[PDB]
Paper text:
Many eukaryotic receptors and enzymes rely on glycosylphosphatidylinositol (GPI) anchors for membrane localization and function.
We used single-particle cryo-electron microscopy (cryo-EM) to determine the structures of GPI-Tsub and GPI-Tprod to 3.22-Å and 2.85-Å resolutions, respectively. The overall structure of GPI-Tprod is very similar to GPI-Tsub, with a root mean square deviation (RMSD) of 0.40 Å. As expected, the main difference lies in the catalytic site. For GPI-Tprod, consistent with the purification results, densities supporting a GPI-AP with the ω, ω−1, and ω−2 residues were evident. Additionally, the CSP, the other product, was visualized in the structure. Supporting this notion, the density for ULBP2* in GPI-Tprod appears less defined than CSP, indicating a more dynamic and departing conformation for ULBP2*.
Numbering used by the authors:
A (entry chain T): 415 to 554
B (entry chain D): 218 to 244
C (entry chain S): 527 to 544
D (entry chain T): 103 to 310
E (entry chain G): 10 to 398, 423 to 481, 491 to 621
F (entry chain U): 2 to 421
């Protein structure tokens, strides 16, 4: 199940039910392109990076020995955290490491100068076309 | 101490305005 | 300002011609 | 026993009678921020997700409609005494008696791992489980490094871990016990050494 | 206007000469106080804090050094079992990576054809923080019976660091094998980029996003001076903040640290100080123009991590510093790096260093290249306006020169198997001999009307200006060195005039001749002369190393040169000999 | 013709060789070559999203029109063949359009020569069939072998398809065909909003070809203009309504046109909108985006005033202005109006500042990848370097286009009044 993110409105969500083979390592890789944001949309520390939320791993890990049905009112509190459905399987919810990714950043000190320069570039075309369309050729 | 964001009026506005007006319009 | 410098000249020329 | 992601993690299960799940989600996030002195007001549509097959209810559930589930996590949220004090003030003994006296802020954060959790869920009132009873489980998991805390001492103690020893149980509690794992995985049925003789020894299949 | 065009016509030669002299003089004025600036911190995260060093494990480092040396002698390679046991003992989270590669040709200098090795690294997981950031302390270990003291000091530093709580970033203690080959394999596997075709086992443990690294090379019990190397692969440099961090601990610990092996005091007496500044600046320029990774730090800079190499030298100077002092300096550097709350973005990334505590930013040395490029621009304008005062004649020289450049790039690595069968030469020597033979065959033009030659020379000048400017932006030293030699001869070349003199000036400033002159200048600056025979031997070794590094590490000097700068010079050769 | 076939073969061979090279991946990811509305990876992503049951317009990666997804659903295979065929078809359309335009302009020149409307001695300015023989071939050669077009088709960008649509609009307009010109202009407006500005040049050329004086008092002009406008609007409305039914939703209109008009991506490009809106105060964001999108449509009317009797040059200038001031410009868009340069190369004698501007454009183009690499991968440069390169590139483009316009005006004035 995958839902796509919308800019400034939704995060990406990607859920998979993978069957891990015995004595193996399974690699789940997905490609991403970093996005350039507005100069006011960055954190106060914009060169530190942006944190990707840790991934959640839910599984029914097999057990060495079978567990008898437990009574939540007569058992230690650490044994009643998760409901147990099968004797030979127990439920674990692992969380992976947070990921620190850096986005490309604007200058943060160039809002006036960029406005001036881009406006000047536009005005170059404006003035040249205005001259060419308005004025007419004359001798001497 | 620190520096607030202030426009470089003399450095850039004058330059990028005198690159347009005397280059195209006035003369 | 680069937009308005030639426009004002045109308006002044029109006013002089009228 | 229990694992949580870095920073704040808030996943909640709304009742089927609710209508505006997102509005109640925002209101509850702000209220929890006020209660626990954490910046949970940053939980927005950009952070919130609705898992389709994960984070099933941890208590009694008639049906599992994920339309009523919201899960948000703030990986950069910090946890400190500013968050532990509201958490400690929600216990009946409130660090005055029982095992809560061991919760020293300096020692708890001198750790490789530290997690503060608040879990609310409905459980069976009796063995027949025909009725609903509400359970609140406030947990605090820490891991003491062998090189930082021990510094080569190679001997562990309650005093050496929490800068404080247990003195009295919480008078409100109907059960206050300390479990120390003494299993030797390699030795033939031997056990770890504990200086004071335990009241009893309990064996069961925990985590497989 | 027409008057401006006529004025350009009349004064092209004086303007070009004045511009070239101005560029040379501007480069030679880079070492003077108006243009050179004293280095400053510019990073408050590291300048507003202080550290109290408590490194006392100077005997543990020596014992580890003796143990590692004995085990390396016994094993005949990097002792993996001992390293993994000792890292576990000191408390690191030890891992192992096994890599392998086949070199294009035998490497005579390092004595390797197919390289197989293992990288041992242990990660100090930072308490009170998730594994999101990382600092690397690496020891480049090669089959040279060296760096045992560096390994011992690395292990002692790891033992000291492990018991502390004030780490916001994981620390990776990496012991590579086969010098920079192991570092490149480890970096490629860590970042999951297959950039050079290295084979390696998948990595099982990572410490998050690497932020800074320090490579330690030490082969003596006591040092007399620390040395810092900043220039990296492809002329890339770390942020100046890392260099300022290293240099600010020399005053703190009373250490004697040198740049390029030269100790330049702060006296800056006008009689002698600028000469030492120029010596250091020229050494840095040549080293940056070579484009090779001089230490293990050079391969780190490609992945946007600021890296430094801190060599230790024992060189008869009476005041011998201690391993404890070196460890204290390293501990302070790593603690101040840990004080960083974000990636190094302050200070500067493009600079030249006429001394350990002096620097020149990009806005202050760029005029040196720009003045030289102005000569090419003026000559191109003059040729354009003289033309305004032939596709068939141009396409043949253009295609022939580009094809010969492509052959110079592609042919030498291949054909060694073919050439060795017929000729009594080695596989490694066949590559260099093929390089030289193709270089000469380019001179021997097979194929070989004023407008044709002015058009061809104008195209060549525009192409040369493009390449010189683009190289100068990425690697100023390479661009400056290429411009200084090719601009005057490219401008001067023309069929009408002294053809023998023009041919001599063109040949003597070809990229091969520029490389030979650079080698001679380098050896002269290191106070170690060269006869013609040993200079030729060093030139051949440099050619072999430059060809090898393009495959091994991805150095751009060989492909860039042999594909863009050789055909462009052949265009000027064809201009000189026009039909 | 044989030379046209030879040029087509050379271009196809070069494109195929670059397709099979190792530089295809490098080219495919260039910000100068691909754009948020034209990347091939985004086409593949939007096609893969439909297989998951997710609408491709619910995300922020896919911004292409339903017609593109329908075309590439059937033709997801042979994509490189599709793009090579589109480039060849653009070359063919431009070749034949220019070949017919040369005949039309020679007939006009012969008419005003017979009427002696020109100056007594303008023999040098007189166009001759010998000089116009290889202009159609050079038009197709400046497009097929342009490095911009080669990169834009090797990267598999739909910019090539939009260029083919514009070229077929030009061809149909030059060969009468008001219906086909309206359909192709509607298709071009479908892919990118800006090509709607070419409506005035197309209408002017059609009126001139049909010999209707363009006068306010004239009624035939109004009748023909109304027919052409209704035909264009109907062809656009039918396309919009039909392509609604592909996903049975209107979500494509935001993801395409609101994306084009509001510039939400802010991803580096050769354009001038990426930084202006990254480094921008939010007080004036709406005002300045309105001004910048007005800029593209600003010059069509005053250009029509001056160039009423020269509609093809007006169309060329309009294409150039679109390619320069588009919200998400591309080197492929820039390469479409550089295919017209051989047409106007008879204006060379009146062209000032040609060498410097060509050198500046070449320098900026070669410097885009180098400074992009320094900023992004090397880390030793800022976004300021890339912004400066975009500024210089666009200034060079603007000055080159105004320079050709000035040369055209000079030639007209000399023809009318007398060359000395
Ligand atoms: N207790 C107590 C406390 O203390 P106290 O006491 O208080 O005290 C202390 C303090 O201190 C401090 O202070 C401060 C600080 O600050 C810090 C900061 O940081 C950051 O920032 C930074 C940044 O980052 C960086 N980046 C930088 O940047 C810069 C900026 O900013 C500035 O502004 C400037 O500089 C910029 O620039 C500019 O601006 C420029 C502009 C101007 C001018 C313009 C020009 C004009 C025009 C031109 C010409 C004309 C034309 C005509 C001609 C004819 C920047 O810089 P950069 O960036 O570096 O860069 C620059 C640039 C770039 O580059 C460019 C280049 C380009 C390339 C090339 C070009 C093209 C070429 C072409 C080719 C040729 C052609 C050929 C042809 C021929 C043929 C034959 C014929 O940029 C730009 O923009 C540029 C512009 C562009 C323009 C244009 C274009 C181009 C060109 C055109 C021309 C020409 C061409 C054509 C033609 C020719 C030929 C033809 C013939 C006819 O900045 C800063 C630094 O400073 C920030 O932060 P962050 O961290 O980042 O973040 C945060 C938030 N989140 C800020 O904010 C801050 O503030 O500190 C400082 C220092 O630092 P350092 O580190 O040390 O340093 C660094 C450096 N790097 C100081 O200073 C201050 O004051 C305070 O604040 C506090 O902190 C403390 O406390
Ligand atoms: C039954 C209705 C059908 C509706 C559907 C039709 C759609 C038509 C749309 C566009 C037509 C495109 C052709 C443009 C060619 C312009 C060339 C031209 O100027 O040639 C002129 C002839 O003038 C014209 O035919 C142009 C009139 C077009 C106005 C239509 C507006 C509504 C259209 C809605 C768009 C729907 C399409 C949807 C899909 C996209 C003659 O130039 P010459 O060189 O041959 O000189 C010979 C002689 O000397 C003058 O003789 P004439 O009597 O024929 O001239 C009268 C007048 C002409 O002035 C103009 O050129 C203004 C029109 C410009 C075209 C606009 C296109 C739309 O000259 C005068 O005397 C008056 C003096 C002052 C007038 C202008 C001064 C200020 C300018 C504008 C007003 C200021 C306000 C700002 C501008 C905004 C506009 C409100
Ligand atoms: C001829 C052909 C054609 C093309 C070409 O050649 C061929 O033409 C060439 C030519 O045309 C060149 C240009 C010429 C003009 C140049 C101008 C130049 O800017 C000036 O550069 C000077 C260099 O000495 C000073 O800048 C210092 O540069 C040092 C690095 O080299 C910094 O180290 C220092 O700042 C440090 O800041 C932190 C402090 O702790 C330190 O003590 C201080 O050293 C800077 O100086 C600082 O510069 C700042 C502006 O950026 C402020 O001015 C600041 O002032 C402080 O202001 C505070 C209040 O705000 C006050 O409290 C405090 O006391 C002051 O100190 C000032 O210290 C000066 O400053 C700054 O302007 C710019 O870099 C490059 C430049 C464009 C050139 C780029 C390349 C070119 C185009 C060449 C090009 C190839
Ligand atoms: C003939 C055909 C083509 C000829 C040339 C083609 C190749 C040219 C390509 C690149 C050459 C341009 C060199 C880049 C200039 C870099 C300078 C720069 O960025 O400086 C930065 C600051 O720069 C600025 O402030 C504004 C820079 C404006 C640059 C304008 C001039 C650049 C190019 C002009 C012409 C180049 C040569 C032309 C000759 C033919 C950093 O400054 P600092 O020193 O770090 O800080 C100290 C205090 N602020
Ligand atoms: C050619 C274009 C101009 C650039 C010229 C810059 C070259 C500067 C040369 C030397 C100064 C920097 C070198 C210092 C690095 C180490 C010192 C040294 O002498 O290395 C030397 C290395 O020399 C170089 O790497 C120079 C750069 C290689 C260029 C080869 C490119 C091939 C293309 C040829 C086509 C024409 C000799 O290597 P070694 O003998 O193996 O070293 C001894 C090892 N035990
Ligand atoms: C494969 C490397 C080719 C280098 C240049 C050979 C082509 C010669 C023709 C014209 C030379 C003018 C450009 C020279 C400027 C220097 C180019 C440069 O250093 O930037 C390179 C990339 O820049 C470019 O894309 C230049 C391509 C423009 C010409 C087509 C760096 O590539 P890398 O280091 O291999 O990527 C690894 C990332 N860590
Ligand atoms: C591949 C990735 C980056 C590559 C960058 C290259 C892209 C450049 C593409 C287009 C830039 C061109 C912009 C201006 C085009 C001018 C159009 C034009 O045809 O003007 C023509 C004028 O041409 C010029 O003046 C420009 C030539 C002067 C400088 C260019 C030549 C030197 C540049 C070569 C550098 C690279 C060389 C490498 C091997 C070729 C008119 O000629 P004509 O009218 O047919 O003459 C007969 C009179 N009856
Ligand atoms: C790259 C262009 C500008 C120049 C061409 C290469 C030069 C850098 C080379 C070519 C021949 C070389 C010379 C060949 C022979 C000698 C003799 C030898 O010097 C001595 O005899 C030392 C003094 C003594 O005689 O005892 C070594 C340096 C020198 C001058 C060499 C210096 C470097 C030279 C000039
Ligand atoms: C084929 C052509 C002729 C179609 C012409 C229609 C466009 C001009 C319209 C159709 C949909 C419109 C967009 C619909 C939604 C938005 C989002 C809107 O931003 C918001 O979310 C603000 C909402 C609010 O203001 O309440 C800004 C305008 C924009 C881009 C609109 C801009 C104008 C668009 C592209
Ligand atoms: C469609 C053609 C035939 C008419 C000419 C188009 C442009 C001259 C102008 C007219 C109205 C303008 C739009 C009016 C409203 C908006 C909403 C505005 O929404 C936002 O505030 C988000 C973007 C931002 O603020 O940066 C974005 C610009 C946009 C699409 C404008 C873009 C430029 C437009 C299309
Ligand atoms: Mg900062």
């Amino acid at each position: 199940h995958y839902q796509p993110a919308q800019d400034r409105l939704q995060p990406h969500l990607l859920e998979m039910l993978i069957q891990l083979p015995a004595n193996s390592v399974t690699k789940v890789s997905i490609q991403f392109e970093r996005a350039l944001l507005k100069w006011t949309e960055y954190t106060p520390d914009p060169n530190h990076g942006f944190y990707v939320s840790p991934s959640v791993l839910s599984a029914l890990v097999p057990s060495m020995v079978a567990a008898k049905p437990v009574d939540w009112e007569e058992s230690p509190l650490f044994n009643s955290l998760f409901p147990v459905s099968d004797g030979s399987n127990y439920f674990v919810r692992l969380y992976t490491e947070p990921l620190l990714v850096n986005l490309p950043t604007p200058d943060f000190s160039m809002p006036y100068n960029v406005i001036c320069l881009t406006c000047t570039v536009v005005a170059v075309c404006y003035g040249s076309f205005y001259n060419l369309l308005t004025r007419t050729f004359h001798i001497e | 101490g620190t520096t607030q964001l202030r426009a470089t009026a003399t450095t850039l506005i004058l330059c990028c305005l005198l690159i347009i007006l005397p280059c195209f319009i006035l003369p | 300002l680069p937009m308005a410098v030639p426009i004002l000249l045109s308006l002044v020329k029109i006013f002089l011609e009228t | 026993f229990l694992q949580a992601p870095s920073g704040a993690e808030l996943w909640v299960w709304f009742q089927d009678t609710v209508t505006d799940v997102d509005k109640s989600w925002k209101e509850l996030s702000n209220v929890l921020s006020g209660i626990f002195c954490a910046s949970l007001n940053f939980i927005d549509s950009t952070n919130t997700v609705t898992p389709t097959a994960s984070f099933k209810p941890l208590g009694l559930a008639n049906d599992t409609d994920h339309y009523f589930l919201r899960y948000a996590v703030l990986p950069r949220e910090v946890v400190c005494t500013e968050n532990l004090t509201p958490w400690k003030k929600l216990l009946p003994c409130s660090s005055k008696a029982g095992l809560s006296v061991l919760l020293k802020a300096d020692r708890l954060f001198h750790t490789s791992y530290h997690s503060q959790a608040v879990h609310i869920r409905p459980v069976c009132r009796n063995a027949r489980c025909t009725s609903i009873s509400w359970e609140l489980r406030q947990t605090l998991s820490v891991v003491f490094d062998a090189f930082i805390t021990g510094q080569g001492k190679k001997d562990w103690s309650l005093f050496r871990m929490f800068s404080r020893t247990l003195t009295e149980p919480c008078p409100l509690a109907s059960e206050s016990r300390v479990y120390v794992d003494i299993t030797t995985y390699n030795q033939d049925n031997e056990t770890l050494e504990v200086h004071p003789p335990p009241t009893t020894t309990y064996q069961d299949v925990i985590l497989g | 206007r027409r008057a401006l065009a006529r004025l350009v016509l009349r004064l092209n030669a004086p303007l070009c000469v004045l511009s070239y002299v101005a560029g040379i003089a501007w480069f030679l004025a880079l070492v003077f106080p108006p243009l050179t600036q004293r280095t400053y911190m510019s990073e408050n995260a590291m300048g507003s804090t202080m550290v109290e060093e408590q490194f006392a494990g100077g005997d543990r480092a020596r014992a580890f050094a003796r143990d590692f040396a004995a085990h390396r002698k016994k094993s005949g390679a990097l002792p993996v079992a001992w390293l993994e046991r000792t890292m576990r003992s000191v408390g690191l989270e030890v891992y192992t990576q096994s890599f392998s590669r086949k070199l294009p040709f035998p490497d005579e200098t390092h004595e390797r054809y197919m390289v197989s090795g293992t990288n041992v690294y242990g990660i100090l997981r930072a308490p009170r923080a998730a594994s999101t950031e990382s600092l690397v302390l690496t020891v480049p270990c090669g089959s040279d019976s060296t760096n045992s003291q560096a390994v011992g000091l690395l292990l002692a530093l790891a033992a000291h660091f492990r018991g502390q709580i004030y780490w916001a970033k994981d620390i990776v203690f990496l012991v590579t094998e086969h010098d920079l080959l192991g570092t490149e394999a480890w970096l490629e596997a860590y970042h999951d980029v297959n950039v050079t075709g290295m084979q390696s086992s998948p990595l099982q443990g990572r410490a998050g996003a690497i932020q800074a690294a320090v490579a330690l090379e030490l082969s003596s019990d006591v040092v007399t001076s620390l040395d810092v190397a900043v220039e990296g692969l492809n002329g890339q440099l770390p942020n100046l903040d890392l260099l300022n961090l290293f240099q600010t601990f020399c005053q703190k610990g009373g250490l004697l640290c040198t740049l390029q092996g030269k100790l330049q005091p702060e006296d800056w007496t006008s009689l002698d100080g600028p000469l030492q500044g120029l010596q250091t600046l020229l050494l840095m320029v040549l080293r940056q123009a070579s484009g090779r990774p001089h230490g293990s730090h050079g391969l780190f800079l490609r992945y946007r991590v600021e890296a430094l190499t801190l060599r230790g030298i024992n060189s008869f100077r009476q005041y011998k510093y201690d391993l404890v002092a070196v460890g204290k300096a390293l501990e302070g550097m790593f603690r101040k790096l840990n004080h960083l709350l974000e990636r190094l973005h302050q200070s500067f990334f493009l600079y030249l260093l006429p001394g350990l505590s002096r620097f020149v930013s990009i806005g202050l040395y760029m005029p040196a290249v720009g003045f030289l490029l102005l000569v090419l621009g003026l000559k191109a304008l003059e040729l354009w306006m003289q033309l305004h005062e032939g596709l068939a004649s141009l396409v043949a020289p253009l295609l022939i020169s580009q094809a010969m450049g492509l052959a110079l790039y592609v042919l030498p690595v291949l054909g060694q198997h073919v050439a060795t069968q017929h000729f009594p030469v080695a596989e490694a020597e066949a590559v260099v001999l093929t390089l030289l033979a193709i270089y000469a065959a380019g001179l021997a033009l097979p194929h070989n009307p004023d407008r044709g030659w002015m058009a061809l020379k104008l195209v060549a000048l525009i192409y040369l200006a493009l390449q010189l400017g683009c190289i100068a932006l990425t690697n100023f030293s390479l661009g400056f060195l290429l411009a200084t030699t090719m601009v005057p001869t490219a401008a001067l070349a023309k069929p009408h005039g002294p053809r023998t003199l023009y041919a001599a000036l063109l040949v003597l400033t070809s990229p091969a001749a520029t490389l030979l002159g650079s080698l001679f200048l380098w050896r002269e600056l290191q106070e170690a002369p060269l006869s013609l025979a040993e200079g030729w031997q060093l030139f051949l070794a440099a050619l072999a190393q430059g060809v090898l590094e393009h495959h091994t590490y991805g150095a751009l000097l060989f492909p860039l040169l042999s594909l863009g700068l050789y055909p462009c010079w052949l265009l000027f050769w064809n201009v000189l000999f026009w039909k | 013709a044989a030379p046209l076939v030879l040029v087509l073969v050379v271009a196809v061979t070069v494109r195929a060789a670059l397709f099979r090279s190792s530089l295809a991946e490098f080219i495919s990811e260039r910000v100068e070559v691909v754009s948020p509305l034209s990347s091939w990876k985004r086409v593949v992503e939007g096609l893969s999203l439909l297989d998951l049951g997710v609408s491709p317009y619910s995300g922020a990666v896919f911004h292409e029109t339903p017609l593109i997804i329908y075309l590439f659903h059937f033709l997801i295979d042979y994509a490189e063949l599709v793009f090579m065929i589109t480039d060849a078809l653009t070359a063919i359309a431009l070749y034949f359009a220019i070949q017919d335009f040369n005949k039309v302009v020679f007939k006009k020149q012969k008419l005003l020569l017979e009427l002696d409307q020109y100056a007594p001695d303008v023999a040098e300015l007189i166009r001759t069939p010998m000089e116009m023989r290889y202009i159609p071939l050079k038009v197709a050669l400046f497009y097929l072998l342009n490095p911009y077009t080669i990169l834009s088709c090797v990267a598999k960008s739909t910019c090539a398809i939009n260029n083919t649509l514009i070229a077929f609009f030009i061809l149909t307009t030059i060969k009468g065909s008001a219906f086909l010109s309206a359909i192709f202009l509607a298709l071009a407006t479908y892919q990118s909003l800006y090509p709607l500005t070419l409506f005035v040049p197309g209408l002017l050329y059609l009126l001139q070809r049909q010999y209707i004086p363009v006068k306010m008092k004239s009624k035939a002009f109004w009748i023909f203009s109304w027919e052409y406008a209704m035909m264009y609007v109907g062809s656009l409305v039918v396309i919009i309504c039909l392509s609604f039914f592909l996903l049975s939703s209107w979500d494509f209109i935001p993801a395409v046109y609101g994306f084009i008009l509001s510039v939400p991506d802010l991803t580096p490009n050769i354009g001038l909108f990426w930084y202006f809106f990254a480094e921008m105060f939010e007080h004036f964001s709406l005002f300045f985006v309105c001004v910048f999108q007005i800029n593209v449509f600003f010059y069509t009317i005053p250009l029509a005033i001056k160039l009423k009797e020269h509609p093809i040059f007006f169309m060329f200038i309009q294409i150039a202005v679109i390619a320069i001031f588009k919200s998400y410009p591309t080197v492929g868009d820039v390469a479409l109006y550089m295919a017209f340069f051989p047409v106007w190369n008879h204006l060379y004698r009146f062209l000032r500042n040609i060498f410097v501007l060509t050198c500046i454009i070449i320098v900026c183009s070669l410097l885009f990848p180098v400074l992009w690499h320094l900023w992004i991968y090397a880390g030793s440069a800022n976004s300021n370097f890339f912004y400066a390169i975009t500024l210089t590139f666009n200034v060079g483009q603007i000055l080159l286009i105004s320079d050709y316009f000035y040369a055209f005006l000079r030639r007209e004035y000399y023809l009318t009044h007398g060359l000395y």
